[PDB]
């Protein structure tokens, strides 16, 4: 642990500075160091961890997609042989992406999930576990691909079960979990009907609970509900 000598509070402070400076790799390294102090994370600290790695892996995914598209075009008929370089470089980016996913999953397994007892923390971490297995599934092609997909499904499903029992239907974590699990169904599991059904039921149940909320909570919930609607519009 390269951050072993830095105070927990200083790591959190620097993660926030790194975010302001749009230095997301630094932000992720600082948050990994904070997690490795062994204490539970607060709600805000969980957000910092998620933002950092979402931005890092999001950039890797975007690059992987660009390279994969070039590689596919290089393998079509009439294409001129350009050597192993496209595959090699796609593989380089892919291996780095897998390394980041493995790091996040490692933090969740050692030992964030097992210490998370409140729904707001446990659902959030299980959602993250589903997300990072989903990113592994996006690039997977080997003997373990079905097991990777099933690991994502299982994490999302445990999060869903807790969220439905312990959170109101407008809770933003519950909504974001459903948003992402719906995307999992559509893009990973080849289950577009399940994706659409989940997004629609989630949206409708949230709508019916908005009446209970303050103006600020309403803003938070409707923001995520709009993402559900956006995906439904894309898919129907």
């Amino acid at each position: 642990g390269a951050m072993g000598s830095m105070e927990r509070a200083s790591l959190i402070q620097k993660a926030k500075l790194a975010e302001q400076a749009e230095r997301y790799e630094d932000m992720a390294a600082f948050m990994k160091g904070a997690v490795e102090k062994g204490e539970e994370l607060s709600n805000e600290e969980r957000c910092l961890l998620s933002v950092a790695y979402k931005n890092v892996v999001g950039g890797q995914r975007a690059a992987w997609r660009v390279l994969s598209s070039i590689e596919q075009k290089s393998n079509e008929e009439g294409s001129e042989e350009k050597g192993p370089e496209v595959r090699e470089y796609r593989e380089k980016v892919e291996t780095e992406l897998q390394g980041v996913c493995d790091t996040v999953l490692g933090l969740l397994d050692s030992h964030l999930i097992k210490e998370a007892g409140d729904a707001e923390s446990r659902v959030f971490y299980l959602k993250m576990k589903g997300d990072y297995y989903r990113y592994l599934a996006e690039v997977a092609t080997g003997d373990d691909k079905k097991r990777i997909i099933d690991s994502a499904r299982s994490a999302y499903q445990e999060a869903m079960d807790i969220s439905k029992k312990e959170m109101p239907p407008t809770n933003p974590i519950r909504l974001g979990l459903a948003l992402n699990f719906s995307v999992f169904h559509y893009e990973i599991a080849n289950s577009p009907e399940e994706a659409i059904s989940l997004a629609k039921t989630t949206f409708d149940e949230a709508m019916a609970d908005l009446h209970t909320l303050s103006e600020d909570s309403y803003k938070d919930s409707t923001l995520i509900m709009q993402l559900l609607r956006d995906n439904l519009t894309l898919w129907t």
Binding site: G176, L179, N180, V183, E187, I224, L227, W235
Partner: peptide
């Protein structure tokens, strides 16, 4: 791509 958070 679809929206995720």
């Amino acid at each position: 791509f679809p929206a995720t958070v």
